[PDB]
Amino acid sequence: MCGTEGPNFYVPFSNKTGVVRSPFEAPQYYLAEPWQFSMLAAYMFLLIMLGFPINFLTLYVTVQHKKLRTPLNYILLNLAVADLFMVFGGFTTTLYTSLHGYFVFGPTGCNLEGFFATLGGEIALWSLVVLAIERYVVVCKPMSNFRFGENHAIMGVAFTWVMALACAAPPLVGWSRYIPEGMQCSCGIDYYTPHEETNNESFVIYMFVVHFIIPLIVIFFCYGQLVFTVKEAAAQQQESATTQKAEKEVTRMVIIMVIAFLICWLPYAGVAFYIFTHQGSCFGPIFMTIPAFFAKTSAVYNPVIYIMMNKQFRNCMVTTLCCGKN
Template sequence: MYKGKQEMMAELSDDFYIPVPMETTNISALSPFLVPQTHLGSPAVFMSMAAFMFLMVVFGFPINILTVICTIKYKKLRSHLNYILVNLAIANLLVVSVGSTVAFYSNAQMYFALGPLACKVEGFTATLGGMVGLWSLAVVAFERFLVICKPLGSFTFRESHAIMGCAFTWIVGLAAATPPLLGWSRYIPEGLQCSCGPDWYTVNNKWNNESYVLFLFCFCFGVPLTTIIFSYGRLLITLRAVAKQQEQSATTQKAEREVTKMVIFMVAGFLVCWLPYASFALWATTHRGELFDLRMASIPSVFSKASTVYNPVIYIFMNRQFRSCMMKLIFCGKNPFGEDEDTSVSAQSTQVSSVSSSQVAPA
């Protein structure tokens, strides 16, 4: 009985879907494009979300745009291994400029005031940027595995390989973000109805949402996560073998500890970004028809958008070379922390026997 009611409500609109109490019959009166969604949360909840999204824009935009500007300005940062980091920054800028900004405005209005078309644009853009960023993290890990662990022997990582890695992330990003525009799932308001994403909780099979969510879970979460764990796992094994051979070297032992810590941060950052979203979407797919609190559904979206801030902190700002160049750019050529950006050595010209922490962190 309840599931039938939910299916009927899902058919009332192609632009939104809200699981509401059974006694509600005029679902159009609750449209997230027309009226404040105060039936889902108090104004304080929406203002809190708006404030959080504002912080994501304030912190996310500068750190990512600085990454791009620094790479253009400082030749030493334009190494092949850093191409993917600029790619990650561009993807983050896409999410911040559209996804986080629209979410801030909509939460401040307490409904998606920009309309259904803007919802589809925001959903597509945020998904594209998110998928490119997600796959960039996997490519970062795989590139460092190739360069440091040398599974291909004398393989030399070249500019063409770096460009191919960046192009790959946009191809798979488009492959993941385009289907909802073509009828395989759809983009609708999610959570508190103030930001848009793929429809992962509709019970109606009209949109084939189940298969799309499973596709995203396997291809856009499972494969990158497996790549990251495998690549960094092999890298740690290689580095520990070097550290064991050089037990008397304090520098090598310190590098091994620092790299281990950095890898833990990288894997944890990936999981914080995407595990909540992937888990919630998978739960909703396997528990069709069950009522859930849409306020809770907003949490995964918040974590994924917050990745535009803490991913750069882990992959870029924690790198000594990038950080030093950023400080010089901000403070007009002076680094107030007195760090030497030249201490980070390119992994391309360094043998495994002299692996340092800067080879794992983007150099």
């Protein structure tokens, strides 16, 4: 063999030895070293012990603090919730699994895991588009001034959850399916079987075009455009350089949250994709394990970039923790 096609799983390990068990019945210790399986669980623990407060803290600095009612404060408060859903939904279940070297919870567990991660990535990807749009509408202003009401922010934040669920939910109902990846301690969209009863190949190419391409294409159109008013339509469009200061600061962060995304997220699809097309070309259980567990930091770093490149915020953040003020 290459790997071992099951009813609800696929493995990158030869059943020519017979040795292949199922990731819903007993240990996959036969995949790497039972020292290595601990490494997942160890990694997962820090990310659980990291995301919880650094995402809890921001989801509260804001709910508490007043002045913090700007369109960015919302989206970074939208990741603030999205991330804790990864952690208490995905991560707890994903970790607990790696100690066992296989899912104990049945596929009924590999749903949360896969789901609540797909989910978090998609709220991230979309929270960027609405962030990108915002920057376009704000920096190189189009026409007049229905300039964002706290309203338009809602319509945006609610926007992400919608779009982001139009990707994660379907595989859950059986437009696709959450299935164990790599070392079988992470679950992600069935790129493996051609399995027919879920029209697999459709959903997978669905999920790319509209939850990858398009999302990016919008992002990218706005990307460059974020260098037009940082110059001449600023030297000409007379905006007090007190605003070409705080606003040219928001643009850096956003720009960096993008890079951040593509640094973190791109390697996963590097494989996810390769798999889909070179389906059944032999490969190991570390091929898709690294990108998965790595890209899984998506539930940690955005609130931090935020403490690191947003001064007003950071100062409320210390006000909170230090009681009264700094």
